[PDB]
Amino acid sequence: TDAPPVLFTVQDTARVITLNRPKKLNALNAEMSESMFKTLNEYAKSDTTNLVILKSSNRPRSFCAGGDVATVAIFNFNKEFAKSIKFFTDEYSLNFQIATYLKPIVTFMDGITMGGGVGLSIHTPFRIATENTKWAMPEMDIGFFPDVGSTFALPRIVTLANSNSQMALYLCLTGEVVTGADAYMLGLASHYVSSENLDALQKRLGEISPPFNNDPQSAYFFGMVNESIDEFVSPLPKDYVFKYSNEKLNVIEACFNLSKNGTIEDIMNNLRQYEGSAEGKAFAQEIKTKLLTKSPSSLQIALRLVQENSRDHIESAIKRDLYTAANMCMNQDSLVEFSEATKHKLIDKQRVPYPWTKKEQLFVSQLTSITSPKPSLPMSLLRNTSNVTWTQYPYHSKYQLPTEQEIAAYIEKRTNDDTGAKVTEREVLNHFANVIPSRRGKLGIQSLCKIVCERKCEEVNDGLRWK
Amino acid sequence: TLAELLGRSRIAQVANNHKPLTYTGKKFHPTHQIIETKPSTLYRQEWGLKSAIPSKIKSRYLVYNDLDTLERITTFEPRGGTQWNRLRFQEMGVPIVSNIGRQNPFFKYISRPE
Amino acid sequence: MKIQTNAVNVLQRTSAYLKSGLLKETPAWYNVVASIPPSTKFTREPRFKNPSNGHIIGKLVDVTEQPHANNKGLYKTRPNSSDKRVGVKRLYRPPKLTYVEDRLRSLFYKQHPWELSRPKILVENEIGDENYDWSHMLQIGRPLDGESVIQRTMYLIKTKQYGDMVEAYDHARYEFYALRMQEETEQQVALEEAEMFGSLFGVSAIEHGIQKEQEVLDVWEKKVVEETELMAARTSN
Amino acid sequence: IPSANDKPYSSQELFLRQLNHSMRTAKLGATISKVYYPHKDIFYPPLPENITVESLMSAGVHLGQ
């Protein structure tokens, strides 16, 4: 009788999944996650479904404002820890299914995509953004950690100032909101399509089918999906200027450059001892202010996970998030304030930050316990139809803007070639815009390459050196 | 959007006019907006209308009613001669005066209920 | 004409030639077309909004939404005949695009007929480059003309400086007169100043017209004489 | 056939003298921006990824029958 929380519909050979909780900004509860997880397993077995499209019925207001953690907070206050662990086993299992799904999934991030919403798109090689996109990970203000495998995705997909996960740590620890074109240029969105063109794109996606004797799970079909979306991409607004200037990118790359045993204090030291331009110095103070209004325990846990899930395989990174979430709802050592902070902000509307009490510096053992499975609480991710793990996304790189590490590899290779030629910025732009088949004519690809060379490369004579 | 752009397009700027292009009555003032094309565009029959104007037209000024019609032609006359009447009036340097001594319509005068 | 099938299925008909062996070698286009499927639906699509004025298409006002009496003083208690006719055709008919500026444009050129005599160039340069601040009437890149007035009027009504469109239009008209008067003086004075420094001009506009009228009046003289002599002979009959 | 240094320029030399002026001086004073040149459509077409609705509209592609 009530409107189903998630609506499933057929679009020719494409199956459209639509989040249908407009009053809650499409917040994800256990019911929604379970429904989507079960229906996706069926579509994986089907031989008539070529691709899936995850969208919202509330666009452009919101796509998914995040998992329903306010309800999980009430569970903690009522000691309904079994209910809380069910909510995270369903959500995290759905994020693992999407990541390893063998058929193309195309998420329309037409609106607020924060928290659980990021998990619905970050794990898909086709995550389309719009002018209305608002990507953020505001967990540090609620006392929680960066969940939904964001500690495995962001350190591997961000394009600028992410050599050592510096930008990934900046977004997860500061909760900065990225909007539209900026999300596309950072690597948060694979494509940038105007909202007005989403209807037409959806129809084209339903009409395309694998040719001859190729299944929809073949790499050939994935290329076809990428090309179809590109036909609907339009040039960026003329006035658009990237959000982060080179100077602001230099602050993040230096102030968030930790070692394998770094701590949040080390970042605080860099932000407090930074030297350089006036804008950079002022920018470092802004970060320091923000990072001092977060949960002292959440920041340390986030850094731990980023330094742990940036070199591990997908399954172990998603499993480690389930353990952390369960080890936080059940606060055995009173080291976190997830439940109390969640009620201060969501259950009760309070603009002021929650006054923090756990302001100590957790030890390496304390962090290990909070992020390790307790032998008394057995929790496992639901089984998906793929049941595969890997350390690198199989398709994200091909269909998004190149990272700063891929441009460096070509400059080093070209600079160390027997040709004995000089690497020139013009040659770099051509090599990324008119050579790679999957990146040919990719929006904002020349602009990104010029940002990298102007900040990372040294122009000597008619050559380029990787500073 | 496309609709917003269209409303501001140069074709939208020309007010709708269906007055006879061939009028044999008394003419007191211009009735159609003169359209001008540059020499480069004239060489390519480009006038900024829907269709190319026939190459026979050598004048750079025309007046039209309909962009397209059921006869698959543009309704136009290759003449722009009301502009030369205005410029010849300017060369005579005779200001236009009111024979009734009314207020100048181009000045925002403070009028009363006289 | 019937929806054609054979133009969009060249890949499938070609694939049968290759599979059977009738065609030995794959054509060069074969791979390109396979990766980029043609659109083959050719359907009529409904539309639920006029993009120009945002009017909603396909909405029926129910009697429950008209509780108050009408202009005649009667309440509406039952659907009328128009409400009971299916209106699917309106969903598919291309909407008529309308603009408020069109009404003002017609007014301006009715009030100023001679503005039509100023040639207008319809050839666009680049619509995307237009960076205009309509706080002022003059703009770098475009002429001063009736459109300058209309866009100024819209900016005034958009900024809510004036409430009635007529008042905003009148305000813009006076700004237009001032700019037109400064230009009429700059041209008159420029000509006067040049002649005072020894500038010479071959043919003036008035002279150009006299010469053209002479060319026509010369042909007219011949024909009149010829046709006033055929009449004399024909009438003599 | 160059003319004698005392004689005036020949018709051919005046043409070459004008061509010299055309290259250097004839374009002094201002540059032209945001103006459509018909020939550049053929010789300097844009790439498909840089095409906008404005660009299509500027060319009159939207004007149907």
Specify the pairing of strand A105-109 against strand A126-129: parallel
Contact between A339 and A76 (Cβ < 8 Å): yes
C64 burial (CB, 10 Å; 0-12 / 13-18 / 19+) is exposed
- Across the interface, whether the CB atoms of A442 and D49 are under 8 A apart is answered yes
Residue A116 annotated to the active site: yes
Non-local CB neighbours of A410 within 8 Å, separated by 6+ positions: A428, A431, A432
- Evaluate whether D34 touches C125 at the Cβ level (below 8 Å): yes
Q: How far apart are CA A205 and CA A143, in angstroms?
A: 40
Q: Which residue has the tokens 């004008």?
A: D18
How far, CA to CA in Å, does A179 sit from each of A170, A243, A246?
Answer: 16, 9, 18
- Closest to A332 in 3D by CA, of A380, A377, A302: A377
Tokens found for residue D6: 């005392």
Residues whose CB is less than 8 angstroms from the CB of residue A326 and which lie 6 or more positions away in sequence, other chains included: A81, A84, A85, A88, A374, A377, A379
Closest Cβ–Cβ partner in C15, C35, C41 for A223: C35
Strands (DSSP E) found in A204-344: none
**Hey, how many other C-beta atoms are within 10 angstroms of the C-beta on B94?**
8
Q: How many residues does chain D have?
A: 65
Cis status, amide bond into A394, omega within 30 of 0: no
- Which of the following is catalytic: A34, A66, A67, A119? A67
A47 CA: distance to closest CA in chain C (Å): 19
Long-range contacts of A418-425 (CB under 8 A, 24+ apart): A422/A461, A422/A462, A422/A463, A422/A464, A423/A463, A423/A464, A424/A462, A424/A463, A424/A464, A425/A449, A425/A450, A425/A453, A425/A457, A425/A459, A425/A464
CA dist., res. A148 & res. A152, Å (int): 9
Longest dimension (CA), chain B: 59
Short-list A92, A12, A7, A100, CA closest to A51: A12
- Asked if A212 and C34 come within 8 Å (Cβ–Cβ), the reply is yes
Count CB neighbours of C170 within 10 A. 13
Q: How was this structure determined?
A: cryo-EM
Q: Name the token pair of C104.
A: 């003002």
Tokens of C233: 């002979």
Which helix (H) or strand (E) element contains residue A15? strand A14-19
Q: Tell me the C-alpha distance between A380 and C61, whole Å.
A: 55
Tokens for C164? 């009635």
- Smallest CA–CA distance from B48 into chain C, residue: C123
Query: Hey, are the CB atoms on B82 and C51 less than 8 Å from each other?
Result: no
The beta-carbon neighbor of C128 closest among D35, D36, D55 is: D55
H or E stretch at C103? helix C100-111
Please state, in angstroms and rounded to a whole number, the distance separating the CA atoms of residues A22 and A7.
12
What's the CA gap between B62 and B41, in Å, rounded? Answer: 14
Supply φ then ψ for residue B102, to 5 degrees: -85, 165
CA–CA separation, B16 and A266 (whole Å): 71
Of the candidates C148, C131, C152, the residue with the CA atom closest to the CA atom of residue C183? C148
Alpha-carbon separation of residue A228 from A106, A153, A267, C136, C185 (angstroms): 11, 24, 43, 44, 59
The 10 Å Cβ neighbour count of residue C145 is 16
Measuring CA to CA, which residue among A123, A68, A62 is closest to residue A96?
Answer: A123
Strand-strand pairing, A134-136 and A178-179: antiparallel
Which structure tokens are listed for A123?
């794990």
Q: Does A40 touch chain D (CB under 8 A)?
A: no
Residues A143 and A355: beta-carbon distance below 8 Å = no
Q: Which two tokens stand for residue A242?
A: 């990237």
Query: Å from D56 to nearest chain A CA?
Result: 12
The Cα–Cα gap between A340 and A355 comes to: 10
Resolution in Å, one decimal place: 2.9
Rounded distance between C-alpha atoms, residue A59 and residue A202, angstroms: 14
Q: Which of A34, A147, A182, A337 is catalytic?
A: A147
**Token pair listed for C192:** 């006067």
Residue A330 — φ and ψ, nearest 5°? -95, 95
Alpha-carbon distance of C170 to C156, in angstroms, equals 11
Identify which of B5, B43, B46 has the shortest CB distance to residue D57.
Answer: B5
* Inter-helix orientation angle B82-91/C205-236, to 10°: 120
Residues 6+ apart with CB under 8 A from C28: none
Per CB-CB distance under 8 Å, the chain D contacts of B5 are 53-54, 57
Chain C residues close to A212, C-beta within 8 Å: 15, 34
Instruction: Report chain D residues whose CB lies below 8 A from the CB of A233.
Output: 49
Taking the alpha carbons of C77, C82, C84, C90 in that order, is the dihedral positive or negative?
negative
Torsion of CA C181, C186, C188, C194, to 10 degrees: 180
Q: Is B67 on the interface with D (CB under 8 A)?
A: yes
Residues A159-190: b if buried by 16+ CB within 10 A, e if exposed:
bbbbebbbbbbbbbbbbbbbebbbbbbbbbbb
A192 touches A129 (CB < 8 A): yes
Q: How far apart are CA A243 and CA A185, in angstroms?
A: 9
Residues A125, A400: Cα–Cα separation, whole Å: 8
What is the three-class DSSP state of C145? coil
Q: How far is CA B23 from the centre of its chain?
A: 15
Residues of chain C with Cβ-Cβ distance to B86 below 8 Å are 114, 117-118
